[PDB]
Symmetry: C2
């Protein structure tokens, strides 16, 4: 039965990792990472998390199954975070949240749900985006199309090409938007651009699906939710796939949520029922640990205060690195202008390096980056900044 099965291709990252590892060089630098890293180059457990885990250890009296949608408080806390407290969506009971196995899990669940309970056949994803979006939707039997977003020339958001490409999309088609910290350009729309897309979306009959994996990494918790909040105020229906992997550093515990928004309570409840059915047929019910931690932190004034501070430190670490990277480049005698790096949010950005420059960087300098020139700024340290910039300069 498995004799003729052909090997799946790779996932460059894991491939890059192994190569990195098996490298005897000393000054090696891995910028191909997909997680946050501190000044020492590690991905530590948050202090607030560790505290929450101690609390669970001492209070948990059972590991009995959670409901299909998971922990209730996790759901309400998640909603407040997304829509802000006092939101009508909330007071109107128009949103239902399901705890899922990470952000990817949320995406998959939304996909299976749409594929069996609606007429959706196509999902539009931005270009230069997170490659895993394609596989998730395709796996549910959905068509995936690409809209223009990034401008590899000017390193910016080509709003015209965007609006223009999105005109080829039909009513009932889904359009996927990154809430903030676009992966992997780091280029987000302005509040005014968000409001324009929202207006246009309603006019065209699109079903917006938000991929929100970096809340708090661009400007702050509330700020980062402006775009989504702009859409929510204008739409009857909406879908949000959120992740807590990065902002809580809970990567391996698979913590995320899928939020369904309908015109009214009666409708969201009827629609949510089919979402649960989709879940029951996948993994049955969600993993409690990670989600319990989140609910414990978000609901504790003390712990929450500590966590917000840890998140701020992460955000600022990143902003510092972007700035420090551009300066060290200019100093080291950088041929080109890299100031655009400072206008981009989150951990990722396209360096603008050619495929051949990337290859050279690694072969000759032990500097690791994805062939697309994408780099993870959290892989930079005040310590490695100099050797990094000198290498790059050498390949320009």
């Amino acid at each position: 039965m498995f004799e003729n099965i052909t090997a799946a291709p790779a996932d460059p990252i894991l491939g890059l990792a192994d190569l990195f590892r098996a490298d005897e060089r000393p000054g090696k630098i891995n910028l191909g990472i997909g997680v946050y890293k501190d000044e020492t180059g590690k991905t530590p457990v948050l202090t607030s998390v560790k505290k929450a885990e101690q609390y669970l250890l001492e209070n948990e009296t059972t590991k009995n199954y959670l409901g299909i949608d998971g922990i209730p408080e996790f759901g309400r806390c998640t909603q407040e975070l997304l829509f802000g407290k006092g939101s009508a969506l909330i007071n109107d009971k128009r949103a239902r949240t399901a705890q899922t196995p990470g952000g990817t899990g949320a995406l998959r669940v939304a996909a299976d749900f749409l594929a069996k309970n609606t007429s959706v056949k196509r999902v539009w994803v931005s270009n230069a985006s997170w490659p895993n979006h394609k596989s998730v939707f395709n796996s549910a039997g959905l068509e995936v199309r690409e809209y223009a977003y990034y401008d590899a020339e000017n390193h910016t958001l080509d709003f015209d090409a965007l609006i223009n490409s999105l005109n080829e999309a039909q009513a009932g088609d889904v359009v996927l938007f990154h809430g903030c910290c676009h992966n992997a350009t780091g280029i987000d729309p302005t509040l005014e651009q968000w409001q324009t897309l929202a207006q246009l979306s309603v006019e065209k009959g699109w079903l917006p699906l938000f991929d929100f994996a970096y809340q708090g990494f661009a400007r702050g918790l509330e700020e980062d939710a402006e775009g989504l909040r702009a859409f929510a105020a204008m739409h009857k229906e909406l879908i949000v796939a959120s992740s807590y992997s990065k902002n809580f550093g809970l990567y391996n515990e698979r913590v995320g949520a899928c939020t369904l928004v309908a015109a009214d309570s009666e409708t969201v409840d009827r629609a949510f029922s089919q979402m649960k059915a989709a879940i029951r047929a996948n993994y049955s019910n969600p993993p409690a640990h990670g989600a319990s931690v989140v609910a414990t932190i978000l609901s504790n004034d003390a712990l929450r205060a500590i966590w917000e501070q840890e998140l701020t430190d992460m955000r600022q670490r990143i902003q510092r690195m972007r700035q420090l990277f551009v300066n060290t480049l200019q100093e080291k005698g950088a041929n080109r202008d890299f100031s655009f790096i400072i206008k981009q949010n989150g951990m990722f950005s396209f360096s603008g390096l050619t495929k051949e420059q990337v290859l050279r960087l690694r072969e000759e300098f032990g500097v690791y980056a994805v062939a697309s020139g994408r780099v993870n700024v959290a892989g930079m340290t005040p310590d490695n900044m100099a050797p990094l910039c000198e290498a790059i300069v050498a390949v320009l």
Copy 2:
């Protein structure tokens, strides 16, 4: 887009639970539960587990993503448990294991894998089986057929009717077997019967898929594996979906595994890669907590000893309850012969009660069971035995 979505039907167990709760009655008894419960009516966290969690709290330094297949030690430990150490399958490197979000998750993964990488179209499941099996497979777009297994007249395994229905199954079709503690008859084949099915399976060109969720609940760890072990010795290819939810009391942490067996190492590796691709398109990578706990216990001589004893205590509670149940009925003036209850393994059994008898028990006595007459013996206690039996007698 969600205006005309029809509400998903119910899941009686969850419907039963809600009804159970809303019951102001005093002597209520819920035999409709799907989990193990102790003499006090609770589902506690195992001592070995709490110890392992302590250990992780103190030793964990990161929550960085696990590989797609999860923790390596979790895998090797799972394989030893399944095939026994020193197994040729292991030494021959013919099996690859993937950590999944519970047993259900493992099933779903196998399904997606089969659906996209092979010519499988049908999956044969036994009758009087676990209903969720249908939904999982259908979700992947697989056909689900039923084979004869349980004999509701004699309360037994009708080997003949079984061998007979399975004849209509063609080569290349998958047949699903419950490793031990058949859900929900509690009727398992004998070693000799397993061996007969194994010989037949090879001859017919079937692809065996084992659902192993109650290892250690029938006779013991190694005993409960005879069947699967009998098949493994005869097949080139095989798939196993195991769960640790019950035997480790880790319900909500979603801990299970999906093991793939091929003819040789090159083949299983090539096939496993497509299995990883299926995972990546689903939830990305697995939840660490639960699985970490399992690997810690299983690899630590002291903890493992403690866990084995805890598992034994659970198994023994059940066998005791079955015995006590039959006896108390008999002395309560029991009409029918329930002695078959003593020959069934695990938490589940069909009491042989009628849909109307079930409805009456609850309406009149507060005793709760599934309309199918399925009862969970772990729901019984030396304390509630008498009343439970008097109620049953009153409806015979």
